[PDB]
């Protein structure tokens, strides 16, 4: 009887941990859209030249924080939470019924939701944060790539135009340098860690499948952002990703994408070679194969978007 006959404080602590893990974690919280709706109302019970609604002030504050020159980007929890709120105000609400009316109404609703905050400088904010990250992975850029994806979801022409105009006006190299560094830090299918994980699982590791790739979500987000940068056959932005006339140096993100694709292909071939001898692939091998094939599909889609719209 290990449950009772124990000190009450130890049981209380265990119950607190289990209760926090099982009950308090509610899903909705019904606050992401309401905050953005409330912050978008200006001149309530009062009143152009004056700075509009608090949302634009918050975006300007974060843009100022990103614009300050420094050698490293500090981890700002407030920026993380607010960027997640803005991202979920559009993506979480608008990520059989194939009627023209319903589909077009959904498109207009998504367009309005994205225009609620991309007219307040969020497109500049995302670019500034990505450039200030200096090509260092972490939770600072994970919440920025997701926000940029949410704003650019569906291939917004206005957002793409604003981002390209900002990039061509600043003419500051370092955004594409950070993008290239982040792409170079992306992981692939590792066979050396697979055997270690298999041994560890056969008796904790504090997780499951956290050593093979562990960042496939980040890789998918980065490549989805790169693809959405030129989703609507944006010829100008497709040309910018290859050669930057205004900048003093060119990075050619397309070649970086193909290099990462070649690396992933080599990793997949090595995995197949390792699994050739066995007749039936076990569950853990299939999970890694699927999680690598998803990233391969994302890279292939990003490569297609560089060509379509000839």
């Amino acid at each position: 009887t290990p449950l009772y006959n124990l000190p009450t404080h130890r049981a209380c602590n265990m119950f607190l941990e289990s209760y926090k893990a099982a009950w308090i974690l509610t899903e909705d919280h019904s606050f992401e859209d309401r905050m953005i709706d409330d912050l978008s109302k200006a001149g309530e019970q009062e009143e152009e030249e004056k700075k509009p609604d608090p949302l634009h002030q918050l975006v300007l504050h974060f843009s100022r924080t990103a614009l300050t020159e420094k050698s490293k980007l500090d981890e700002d929890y407030l920026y993380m939470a607010y960027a997640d709120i803005m991202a979920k105000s559009c993506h979480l609400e608008e990520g059989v019924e194939v009627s023209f009316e319903e589909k077009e109404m959904e498109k207009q609703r998504l367009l309005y939701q994205q225009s609620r905050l991309h007219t307040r400088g969020a497109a500049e904010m995302v670019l500034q944060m990505i450039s200030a990250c200096k090509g260092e992975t972490g939770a600072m850029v994970s919440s920025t790539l997701k926000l940029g994806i949410s704003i650019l979801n569906g291939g917004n022409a206005e957002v793409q135009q604003k981002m390209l105009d900002y990039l061509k006006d600043k003419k500051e190299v370092g955004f594409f340098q950070s993008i290239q560094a982040l792409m170079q830090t992306c992981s692939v299918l590792d066979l050396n860690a697979f055997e270690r994980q298999n041994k560890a699982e056969g008796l904790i590791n504090r997780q499951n499948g956290e050593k093979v790739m562990a960042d496939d979500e980040f890789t998918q987000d980065l490549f989805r952002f790169l693809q959405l940068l030129c989703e609507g056959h944006n010829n100008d932005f497709q040309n910018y990703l290859r050669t930057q006339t205004g900048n003093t140096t060119t990075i050619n993100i397309i070649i970086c994408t193909v290099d990462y694709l070649l690396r992933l292909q080599e990793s997949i071939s090595d995995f197949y070679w390792y699994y050739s001898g066995k007749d039936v692939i076990e569950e853990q091998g299939k999970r890694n194969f699927s999680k690598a094939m998803s990233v391969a599909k994302q890279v292939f889609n990003s490569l297609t978007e560089y060509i379509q719209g000839p």
Binding site: P2, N13, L16, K20, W23, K41, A200, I204
Partner: protein, 738 residues
């Protein structure tokens, strides 16, 4: 002259303001000795008079208020602010009597949350320990305390002045105190907030402050308008934001304490119910097939696994799978609904009636009215708004720092908390001898506490190891050698308390190995991986490569530290080699077995750098194992630490490591060509004749003259030889005779 004459004399006013600034800066950051000394210059009476002086210039008024704060309350308020981030609620009877204070409180109708910051709290916070100032006492520093001022009179005075300022600000007087609204409100609001964080204000005083801030909402059920309804500048709005942040923190702490109080009762009820269920299972239930499914699936799992599934009653309404009676589930669901109502997520032109609504409306109104320019006010306003909108996430983030203890350990945990606060206070002081001694004594007192080894989870929640590691980073990045030894001893003892502590400390292995007699960071790194199969398997290749490179560097070049003392000069240092080889013995040999990957990689790195094997086993011109051992023996009996013993110790450690990296027997007998490749490499590295000769060395044994163990041959060296022989060579029939 009169100090009020400085209103028209602007040349002396600047000098006096900067003199007060110098007074504050000299005694800043917990310099209680200078704080005591400054009481002879700026006495208590002068500060009290300047507090109530309505004709003082604004800069002088602000300077005097800040001087009083920085002299009498700064260090204690800093300590209390540091302690406020962690909740340690004991299971005292008043904690049991503590309720949620929900909308449905004692007197209420499920609508009123009460007033924040007023009530009963039980989280443990150490006292302030002030000391009276006196300049006539005899001269004797054991942590001089801050000068003492009457806190009750100061609190009453501050409340009276804040009320008077609030009343006078509604009349729109053309001569505000200090010459401006900011110079009238900010200096007193800072003092009020500081005393609020200090926990000096009582329940009635808290109610008075709440009424003064907003009487429409904070009252008990064109007429004395509150602070939030006036037109204030940004400097006053920042202080208002701090004041409201204090109340929000108080509400969160109350929520955590109430959750723990409910947890106590629920744990008691669940224990009683499970005891009754087991009694029924034992006495009754003798007619079924032993009920193995209803017994081994519930009463055989660990208590952590016995409580997670027991909480699957609701949230699905179709998957109970637990022996929980319906009434208990209803009670827990009622508490959950009450908690959700408290967090402002209730309900599945009116004036606000709760703190969250008032703060959100005020922040939105402030941002809508004017374009705020100061970044600090913008950040504070938006952080407060985010906290108010999302309270469940705030509770989720604050929960991991919450701990529950029995009332029988309060006295010991108070001393532990005081020592930790002393460490934190010392963390912001330039490194010095007195500071080093104080911090070492506090670390030792933390060590000797019985709480330290009884609640490792509480120690990890407080981040004690992180604080001690920050101290080591500060001292290392030599000076103060004793401090790093004390720090490494503390970390080594902390690692062995529990597996979770070792896992947490393993995350800093790269830093520990990079910065590599008493304890060493290398000792901490070794203790963070010792006897941990999962941690050993997770060890990175670069971590071993760094140690291999350090071993090669130490073997190739001798350390001049030993050359400084009386010792012969040689081109190879054995002590560093032995110390570096000690760590590698724990990353390849765990629980008597051997990890294949780590052993293979360390063997590869060792063979790719032959210099790590010493001057004997390197290559051409090498003397050999027997010759090296005999040369060390010959050195042992002539002047030429005591050199000569370390010469054999290094080789013994290297051979022990090489033997421990040998593949397992069943690996060899079941194919695994890489195992035989590694075995062949080890075979060709050193011959059998060398081992047989090494075991054959003779030993040396008025009274009998026994040679010193630290300056002569020791059979512990032969132990490595025997282990190596067993683990690669073995004996079947040939060597079994000689």
């Amino acid at each position: 002259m009169d100090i009020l004459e400085l209103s028209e004399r602007l040349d002396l006013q600047r000098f006096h303001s900067h003199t007060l600034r110098l007074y504050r800066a000299v005694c800043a950051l917990g310099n209680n000795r200078v704080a005591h000394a400054l009481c002879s210059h700026v006495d208590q009476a002068q500060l009290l008079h300047a507090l109530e002086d309505a004709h003082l210039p604004g800069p002088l008024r602000a300077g005097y208020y800040d001087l009083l704060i920085s002299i009498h309350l700064e260090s204690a308020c800093r300590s209390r602010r540091s302690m406020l981030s962690e909740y340690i609620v004991p299971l005292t009877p008043e904690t049991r009597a503590i309720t949620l204070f929900p909308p449905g409180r004692k007197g209420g109708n499920a609508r009123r949350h009460g007033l924040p910051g007023v009530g009963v709290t039980t989280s443990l916070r150490p006292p302030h320990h002030f000391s009276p100032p006196c300049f006539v006492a005899a001269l004797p520093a054991p942590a001089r305390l801050s000068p003492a001022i009457p806190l009750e009179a100061l609190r009453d005075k501050a409340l009276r002045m804040l009320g008077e300022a609030v009343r006078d600000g509604g009349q729109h007087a053309r001569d505000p105190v200090g010459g401006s609204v900011e110079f009238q409100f900010v200096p007193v609001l800072k003092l009020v907030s500081t005393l609020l964080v200090m926990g000096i204000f009582g329940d009635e005083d808290v109610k008075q402050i709440l009424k003064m801030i907003e009487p429409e909402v904070f009252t008990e059920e064109d007429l004395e308008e509150g602070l939030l309804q006036m037109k204030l500048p940004e400097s006053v709005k920042l202080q208002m934001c701090n004041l409201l942040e204090y109340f929000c923190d108080q509400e969160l702490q109350h929520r955590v304490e109430s959750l723990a109080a409910f947890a106590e009762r629920y744990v008691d009820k669940l224990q009683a119910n499970q005891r009754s269920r087991y009694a029924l299972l034992m006495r009754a239930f003798t007619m079924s097939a032993a009920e193995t499914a209803r017994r081994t699936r519930e009463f055989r799992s660990p208590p952590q696994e016995q409580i997670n599934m027991l909480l699957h009653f609701k949230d699905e309404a179709d998957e109970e799978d637990c022996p929980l009676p319906e009434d208990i589930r209803q009670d827990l669901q009622d508490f959950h609904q009450d908690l959700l109502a408290h967090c402002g997520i209730q309900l599945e032109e009116k004036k606000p009636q709760s703190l969250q609504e008032l703060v959100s409306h005020m922040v939105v109104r402030w941002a809508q009215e004017d374009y705020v320019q100061s970044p600090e006010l913008v950040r504070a306003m938006f952080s407060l708004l985010h906290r108010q909108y999302d309270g469940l996430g705030e509770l989720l983030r604050a929960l991991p720092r919450a701990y529950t203890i029995s009332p029988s350990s309060v006295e010991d945990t108070m001393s532990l908390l005081e020592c930790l606060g002393q460490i934190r206070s010392l963390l912001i002081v330039q490194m010095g001898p007195q500071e080093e001694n104080l911090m070492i004594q506090s670390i030792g007192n933390i060590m000797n506490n019985k709480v330290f080894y009884q609640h490792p989870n509480l120690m990890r929640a407080l981040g004690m190891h992180e604080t001690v590691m920050e101290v080591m980073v500060n001292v290392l990045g030599i000076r103060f050698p004793k401090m790093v030894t004390s720090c490494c001893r503390f970390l080594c003892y902390f690692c062995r308390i529990s597996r979770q502590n070792q896992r947490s400390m393993f995350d800093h292995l790269s830093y520990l190995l990079e910065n590599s007699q008493g304890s060493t960071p290398l000792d901490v790194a070794a203790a963070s991986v010792i006897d941990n199969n999962e941690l050993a398997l997770a060890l990175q290749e670069q971590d071993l490569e760094k140690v291999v490179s350090y071993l090669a560097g130490c073997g190739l070049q001798s350390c001049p530290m030993l050359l400084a003392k009386g010792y012969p000069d040689i081109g190879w240092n054995p002590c560093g080699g032995e110390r570096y080889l000690d760590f590698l013995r724990f990353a390849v040999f765990v629980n008597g077995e051997s990890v294949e990957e780590n052993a293979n990689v360390v063997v590869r790195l060792l063979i790719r750098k032959p210099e790590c094997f010493g001057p004997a086993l390197r290559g051409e011109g090498g003397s050999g194992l027997l010759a090296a051992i005999e040369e060390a023996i010959r050195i042992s009996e002539d002047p030429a630490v005591h050199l000569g013993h370390a010469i054999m110790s290094f080789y013994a450690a290297l051979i022990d490591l090489l033997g421990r990296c040998a593949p397992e027997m069943h690996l060899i007998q079941a194919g695994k060509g890489e195992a035989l490749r590694i075995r062949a490499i080890l075979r060709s590295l050193v011959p059998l004749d060398d081992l047989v000769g090494i075991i054959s060395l003779p030993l040396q044994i008025g009274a009998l003259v026994q040679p010193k163990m630290s300056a002569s041959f020791v059979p512990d060296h032969k132990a490595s030889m025997v282990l190596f022989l067993d683990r690669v060579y073995g004996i079947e029939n040939q060597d079994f005779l000689l």
